[PDB]
Amino acid sequence: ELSFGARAELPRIHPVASKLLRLMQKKETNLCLSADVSLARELLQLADALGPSICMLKTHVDILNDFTLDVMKELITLAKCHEFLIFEDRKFADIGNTVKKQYEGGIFKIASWADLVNAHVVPGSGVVKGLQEVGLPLHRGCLLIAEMSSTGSLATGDYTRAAVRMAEEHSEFVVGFISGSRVSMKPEFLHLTPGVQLEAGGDNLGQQYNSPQEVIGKRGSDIIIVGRGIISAADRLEAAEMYRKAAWEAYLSRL
Amino acid sequence: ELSFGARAELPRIHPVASKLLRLMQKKETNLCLSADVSLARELLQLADALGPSICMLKTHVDILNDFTLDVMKELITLAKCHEFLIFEDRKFADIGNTVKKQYEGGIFKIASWADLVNAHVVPGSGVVKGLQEVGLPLHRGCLLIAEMSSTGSLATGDYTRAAVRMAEEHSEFVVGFISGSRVSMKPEFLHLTPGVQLEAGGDNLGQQYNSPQEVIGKRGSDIIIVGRGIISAADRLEAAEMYRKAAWEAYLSRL
Numbered sequence A, B: 001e002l003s004f005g006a007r008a009e010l011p012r013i014h015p016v017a018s019k020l021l022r023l024m025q026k027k028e029t030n031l032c033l034s035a036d037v038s039l040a041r042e043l044l045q046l047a048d049a050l051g052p053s054i055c056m057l058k059t060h061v062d063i064l065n066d067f068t069l070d071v072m073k074e075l076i077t078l079a080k081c082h083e084f085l086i087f088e089d090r091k092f093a094d095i096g097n098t099v100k101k102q103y104e105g106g107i108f109k110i111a112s113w114a115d116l117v118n119a120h121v122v123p124g125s126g127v128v129k130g131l132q133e134v135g136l137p138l139h140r141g142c143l144l145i146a147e148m149s150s151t152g153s154l155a156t157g158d159y160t161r162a163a164v165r166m167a168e169e170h171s172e173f174v175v176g177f178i179s180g181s182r183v184s185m186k187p188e189f190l191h192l193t194p195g196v197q198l199e200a201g202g203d204n205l206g207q208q209y210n211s212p213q214e215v216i217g218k219r220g221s222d223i224i225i226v227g228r229g230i231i232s233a234a235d236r237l238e239a240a241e242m243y244r245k246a247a248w249e250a251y252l253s254r255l
């Protein structure tokens, strides 16, 4: 097992992964903020205040009531100032021909500002090939959704394995997974795990939570994705710090 | 085995499904146009010219370069004038809490204009319960993706069986399936099938094509979804009419 810093230098490491792993080591953070807010000012205030505490900001641009490309320009400024990657949680899940247009075009022009995007493997490897035709020239990466956090999730067994194969066979664009645990034994791949809170529980629509120690420590993932655990707290800064120190120590102790 | 017009009056039928089934019978069409274009002017001219030939217009609003809600206003006017439903092919595929916001909010406000949307079942039934919270009040319907047309699709076997099961358990909101064939023996559910062209072929990003006669006649689906077989043709009206008459005769011969 290697540190984030050593993993950033692996021969087969993707540039976007390497960038990520370098700033994770530098800033002592393996926390991805899930900025699930509907107003751009909120988004930008959270990105500014929490920037120093996070390795990555996961967006859902399609829930932003006042999206504009300028909001994303301002977000990029914050990402560069504070050193975090931008991850648009689009869950591409269509045929290659359709996802290609969805990633490059429309109002959102997701490929123009997102270091990372993600995709479901359900359509087969066409979904990755289609995204790649846009992502590769723009030097972007992709995460494949190998497991989900929600109750009744079908991303289990052979579906999970099928996700792992697809990532391994498309390593020039695929940099890792959204998963509940380590699913690949190859150190070049990132594992990012949502459905994380300090306290036990869930929501009224199928979400289930596990702690950072569980996820990073016992299950061997690299990075926690946390939304309401931070966003609903009163002091979002202290809450981010708490999650960061939780995920970081879990990591060091596993090392 | 009942005609569309008869199925429209089935006891357990959804009001949206009943509206569709009636206009299908009346207009002699079981063709859904996949309006896969990036210009609002092109979308609206296709919707006006092809409107009399189609039971439904399927959108990917996220590829429209000049989307405004006004554009959707104008599409609704045409949908009412010519009698077809509007189907946003968003493929919701996240936790219940996330998809509820993606459906209702953001720039697109999908729920405000789409009669129908679809969802992947991989998250478990929470994806449907989240969408339902917005859609049921708005008298909308949802399609569950039971099978995909693309090479390497993982929507098979127990995955497909789980989709049918989730459909049958949320029948107050779910009106049917995106599938390759008939997957449910209950006639209140609609079966819509993509990957349809008159000629043999595919694309270079994993799409696979079958004929209206195959998909409606042998495999027993209700409605063909057709993109490029119409859109890339010179005469899009003549193309639509060819696909309509193929799908309608296919259905007539089954009954």
Ligand SMILES: O=c1cc(S)n([C@@H]2O[C@H](COP(=O)(O)O)[C@@H](O)[C@H]2O)c(=O)[nH]1
Pocket (backbone or CB within 6 Å): A034, A036, A060, A089, A147, A148, A149, A150, A178, A194, A195, A196, A207, A225, A226, A227, A228, A229, B094, B095, B098
């Ligand atoms: O399996 C998943 C995958 C993701 S990316 N997510 C996302 O992580 C975030 C979880 O938010 P939380 O429950 O508020 O922490 C949401 O944006 C989800 O859409 C998830 O909840 N389950």
Ligand SMILES: O=c1cc(S)n([C@@H]2O[C@H](COP(=O)(O)O)[C@@H](O)[C@H]2O)c(=O)[nH]1
Pocket (backbone or CB within 6 Å): A094, A095, A098, B034, B036, B089, B147, B148, B149, B150, B178, B194, B195, B196, B207, B225, B226, B227, B228, B229
């Ligand atoms: O399994 C599917 C499901 C859908 S909805 N579709 C959609 O139908 C259309 C197929 O278009 P064509 O290949 O140009 O006919 C695209 O918009 C796809 O997103 C598909 O191709 N395969």
